[PDB]
């Protein structure tokens, strides 16, 4: 069974420009467990990114939370880059303030 990952990019708290926050990328519903997840700032990989411990849901598909501390601004763009065996090329999901 091969399940492609679902991806959500969001902040821990509502985005306030200039105030510290946490940038999250939640990947879930995928199988097998091998996956590469990167957080991007203006298209560039953020180096210091942590992630939760591998777990799975009732249907056996896996989920992971990748997160890093960030200070959002009005100009900076953020995204989450995900590669998986079910994807021919990495998928990039841009961060949206309202999602």
């Amino acid at each position: 069974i091969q399940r492609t990952p679902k991806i959500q990019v969001y902040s821990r708290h509502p985005a306030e420009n200039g105030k510290s926050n946490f940038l999250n990328c939640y990947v879930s519903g995928f199988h097998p467990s091998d996956i590469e997840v990167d957080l991007l700032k203006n298209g560039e990989r953020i180096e210091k990114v942590e992630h939760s411990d591998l777990s799975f849901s009732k249907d056996w598909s896996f989920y992971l939370l990748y997160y890093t501390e960030f200070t959002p601004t009005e100009k900076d763009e953020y995204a989450c880059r995900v590669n998986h065996v079910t994807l021919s090329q990495p998928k990039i999901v841009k961060w949206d303030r309202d999602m």
Partner: protein, 270 residues
């Protein structure tokens, strides 16, 4: 109403070393332990404050059980490759989930490559094998009378330590955090607009978010994102509908949650 659950994931790595074994333990939606065979010095590590005081003897004993379970899953993965006549060149995944509910019900089920493999029946005295390969595993576990060990653990050890964990972390594990909620409004065209109903910072994760129009469910028209972790132990969720502009007030968001004494009803508030 209260549960302790363990999750095992063992993934074979052809020519990239021995399989990786990762185990996590939860009380409800709060993780309290992890073990990763790829860590430097693998050992059981606390992930919740209410197990950090259990003592070094507790943790050395947990670590030893994790290392044995890791070793056993290596043999099991190769055994499973034999049952299915699979090449040694491909990676495969063995998943196990077991735990107890409050003592309401215990469970222990396994999956191979994302598909149901074998599960302990609700009576805790027999198994359901998903295919002829799992019947081999079933016959093994019957000969070793493994159902009584699981019945002993689930009906005794699992509930005893779950009750202890719930007492140690009473201030976080037994108080629900109600969702902070609000409705946002985003025009899509000059004739339509999205209403998004937010629920933030709630615990536990179980929640129900529904949009109604004139008081009737819009499940077919509602976009429901998966409940996601905030990173601080609380969770978030939202539901959205696209509405004809000018009749936003016909829509109500209804959120059910443990932390709410009654279901909430929200409308967009310009």
């Amino acid at each position: 109403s209260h549960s302790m659950r363990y999750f095992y994931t063992a993934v074979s790595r052809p020519g990239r070393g021995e399989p990786r074994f990762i185990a996590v333990g939860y009380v409800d939606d709060t993780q309290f332990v992890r073990f990763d065979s790829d860590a430097a010095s693998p050992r059981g590590e606390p992930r919740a404050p209410w197990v950090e005081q259990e003592g070094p003897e507790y943790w050395d004993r947990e670590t030893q059980k994790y290392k044995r379970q890791a070793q056993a899953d290596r043999v099991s993965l190769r055994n499973l490759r034999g049952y299915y006549n699979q090449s040694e060149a491909g990676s495969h995944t063995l998943q196990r989930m077991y735990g107890c509910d409050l003592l309401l019900r215990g469970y222990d089920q396994s999956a191979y490559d994302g598909k149901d493999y074998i599960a302990l029946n609700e009576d805790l005295r027999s198994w359901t094998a998903a295919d002829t390969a799992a019947q081999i595993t079933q016959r093994k576990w019957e000969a070793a009378r493994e159902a009584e060990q699981w019945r002993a653990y689930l009906e005794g050890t699992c509930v005893e330590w779950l009750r202890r964990y719930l007492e140690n972390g009473k201030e976080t594990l037994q108080r629900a955090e109600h969702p902070k909620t609000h409705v946002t409004h985003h025009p899509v065209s000059d004739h339509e607009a999205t209403l998004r109903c937010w629920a933030l910072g709630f615990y536990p994760a179980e929640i129900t978010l529904t949009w109604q129009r004139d008081g009737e469910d819009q499940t077919q028209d509602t976009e429901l994102v998966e409940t996601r972790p905030a990173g601080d132990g609380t969770f978030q969720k939202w539901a959205a509908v696209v509405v004809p502009s000018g009749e936003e007030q016909r829509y109500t968001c209804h959120v059910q949650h443990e932390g709410l004494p009654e279901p909430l009803t929200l409308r967009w508030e310009p």
